[PDB]
Design a protein around this motif. Structure first.
Motif, mmCIF file in Angstrom:
data_model
loop_
_atom_site.group_PDB
_atom_site.id
_atom_site.type_symbol
_atom_site.label_atom_id
_atom_site.label_comp_id
_atom_site.label_asym_id
_atom_site.label_seq_id
_atom_site.Cartn_x
_atom_site.Cartn_y
_atom_site.Cartn_z
ATOM 1 N N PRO A 1 0.830 -1.223 0.000
ATOM 2 C CA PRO A 1 0.000 0.000 0.000
ATOM 3 C C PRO A 1 0.866 1.277 0.000
ATOM 4 O O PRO A 1 2.044 1.200 0.289
ATOM 5 C CB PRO A 1 -0.800 -0.103 1.293
ATOM 6 C CG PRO A 1 -0.038 -1.090 2.152
ATOM 7 C CD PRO A 1 0.643 -2.029 1.224
ATOM 8 N N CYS B 1 -3.596 5.324 -2.184
ATOM 9 C CA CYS B 1 -3.663 4.263 -3.173
ATOM 10 C C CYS B 1 -5.118 3.851 -3.234
ATOM 11 O O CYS B 1 -5.909 4.234 -2.397
ATOM 12 C CB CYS B 1 -2.786 3.062 -2.798
ATOM 13 S SG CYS B 1 -3.164 2.386 -1.226
ATOM 14 N N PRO C 1 -7.288 0.133 -3.806
ATOM 15 C CA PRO C 1 -7.237 -1.279 -4.046
ATOM 16 C C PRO C 1 -7.990 -1.682 -5.282
ATOM 17 O O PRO C 1 -9.076 -1.136 -5.559
ATOM 18 C CB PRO C 1 -7.878 -1.898 -2.784
ATOM 19 C CG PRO C 1 -8.764 -0.901 -2.292
ATOM 20 C CD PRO C 1 -8.120 0.457 -2.622
ATOM 21 N N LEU D 1 -9.767 -4.950 -6.668
ATOM 22 C CA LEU D 1 -10.310 -6.122 -6.003
ATOM 23 C C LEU D 1 -10.683 -7.164 -7.004
ATOM 24 O O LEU D 1 -11.164 -6.831 -8.119
ATOM 25 C CB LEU D 1 -11.609 -5.773 -5.206
ATOM 26 C CG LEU D 1 -11.426 -4.614 -4.192
ATOM 27 C CD1 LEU D 1 -12.733 -4.356 -3.458
ATOM 28 C CD2 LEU D 1 -10.332 -5.018 -3.167
ATOM 29 N N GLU E 1 -12.107 -1.387 -8.889
ATOM 30 C CA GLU E 1 -11.363 -0.566 -7.908
ATOM 31 C C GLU E 1 -12.322 -0.084 -6.805
ATOM 32 O O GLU E 1 -13.500 0.054 -7.055
ATOM 33 C CB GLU E 1 -10.765 0.669 -8.584
ATOM 34 C CG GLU E 1 -10.165 0.394 -9.945
ATOM 35 C CD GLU E 1 -9.658 1.701 -10.656
ATOM 36 O OE1 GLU E 1 -10.158 2.804 -10.333
ATOM 37 O OE2 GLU E 1 -8.823 1.594 -11.570
ATOM 38 N N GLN F 1 -9.522 5.385 3.643
ATOM 39 C CA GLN F 1 -8.932 4.144 4.053
ATOM 40 C C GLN F 1 -9.833 3.391 5.035
ATOM 41 O O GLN F 1 -9.989 2.232 4.895
ATOM 42 C CB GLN F 1 -7.549 4.462 4.676
ATOM 43 C CG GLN F 1 -6.981 3.418 5.532
ATOM 44 C CD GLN F 1 -5.499 3.714 5.857
ATOM 45 O OE1 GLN F 1 -4.591 3.023 5.347
ATOM 46 N NE2 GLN F 1 -5.251 4.753 6.671
ATOM 47 N N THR G 1 -13.025 2.055 3.124
ATOM 48 C CA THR G 1 -12.596 1.018 2.217
ATOM 49 C C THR G 1 -12.438 -0.339 2.929
ATOM 50 O O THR G 1 -13.004 -1.355 2.481
ATOM 51 C CB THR G 1 -11.318 1.514 1.464
ATOM 52 O OG1 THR G 1 -11.783 2.522 0.542
ATOM 53 C CG2 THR G 1 -10.743 0.420 0.627
ATOM 54 N N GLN G 2 -11.708 -0.327 4.038
ATOM 55 C CA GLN G 2 -11.507 -1.500 4.902
ATOM 56 C C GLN G 2 -12.821 -2.046 5.449
ATOM 57 O O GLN G 2 -13.041 -3.251 5.469
ATOM 58 C CB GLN G 2 -10.589 -1.114 6.080
ATOM 59 C CG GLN G 2 -9.183 -0.787 5.630
ATOM 60 C CD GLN G 2 -8.210 -0.403 6.775
ATOM 61 O OE1 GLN G 2 -8.486 -0.626 7.961
ATOM 62 N NE2 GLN G 2 -7.067 0.179 6.394
ATOM 63 N N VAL H 1 -7.858 -8.383 -2.427
ATOM 64 C CA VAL H 1 -7.110 -7.203 -2.822
ATOM 65 C C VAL H 1 -5.895 -7.694 -3.649
ATOM 66 O O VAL H 1 -4.991 -8.279 -3.104
ATOM 67 C CB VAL H 1 -6.636 -6.404 -1.576
ATOM 68 C CG1 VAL H 1 -5.732 -5.252 -1.977
ATOM 69 C CG2 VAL H 1 -7.851 -5.913 -0.702
ATOM 70 N N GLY I 1 -3.732 -5.866 -5.224
ATOM 71 C CA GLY I 1 -2.677 -4.893 -5.127
ATOM 72 C C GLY I 1 -3.314 -3.526 -5.115
ATOM 73 O O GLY I 1 -4.561 -3.408 -4.940
ATOM 74 N N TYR I 2 -2.489 -2.472 -5.346
ATOM 75 C CA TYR I 2 -2.927 -1.077 -5.230
ATOM 76 C C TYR I 2 -2.522 -0.299 -6.467
ATOM 77 O O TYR I 2 -1.508 -0.619 -7.072
ATOM 78 C CB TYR I 2 -2.408 -0.393 -3.936
ATOM 79 C CG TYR I 2 -2.820 -1.167 -2.707
ATOM 80 C CD1 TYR I 2 -4.052 -0.960 -2.110
ATOM 81 C CD2 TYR I 2 -1.984 -2.201 -2.183
ATOM 82 C CE1 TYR I 2 -4.453 -1.722 -1.027
ATOM 83 C CE2 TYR I 2 -2.381 -2.962 -1.086
ATOM 84 C CZ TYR I 2 -3.612 -2.701 -0.504
ATOM 85 O OH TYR I 2 -4.007 -3.491 0.558
#
Lengths: 99, 99
Positions: free
Chosen positions: A15, A19, A21, A23, A69, A74, A77-78, A93, A95-96
């Motif tokens: 991260p 950024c 993610p 998905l 995306e 943050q 998003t989580q 996830v 990557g970013y």
């Protein structure tokens, strides 16, 4: 990978501030009667930007894959990712990417 | 009709009180950067419940089809449908279902 080469190219494992993610979402038999992405957009104030999808309506329910995306703070998003999983949508996830 | 048999069975051509539009959305080069369905969910307080989707990513943009129901009040689903058309998403109301 079997993600687009454009994403293979910009995806970063680690991260980095603001950024976003990328998905992979997998539906495993949910009813269409569950409005899971539309609910996360209001509940978590995120955008789920569809990249591609192979979503099948089989046996009267939903089985298949989407690349997306997820844009948002943050924390939001989580919380959205975890809530999707708590409804048994598999979420990876990959990557970013930037912004 | 070319939609799943259970939907073909349930589909009504005439809009009735508290009916649900069954949409076909056709993507013809929208950028991945436009959060169309997420924004309608918040803006118009609708749910876009994905039935199925066969969406491809190419050149940074999107091509393909999605089948959805849209849930919301009559005025909200009318406004979301009109706004998707205003933003050049090809939308077709295939008919209406309960509930």
């Amino acid at each position: 990978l079997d993600i687009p080469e454009d994403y293979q190219e910009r995806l970063q494992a680690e991260p980095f501030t603001d950024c976003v993610p990328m998905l992979r979402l997998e539906f495993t038999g949910q009813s269409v009667d569950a409005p899971l992405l539309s609910e996360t957009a209001r509940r978590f104030n995120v955008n789920n930007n569809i990249i591609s999808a192979q979503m099948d309506y089989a046996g009267g329910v939903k089985f298949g894959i989407m690349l997306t995306e997820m844009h948002g703070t943050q924390q939001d998003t989580q919380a959205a990712i975890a809530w999707l999983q708590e409804h048994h949508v598999k979420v990876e996830v990959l990557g970013y990417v930037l912004e």
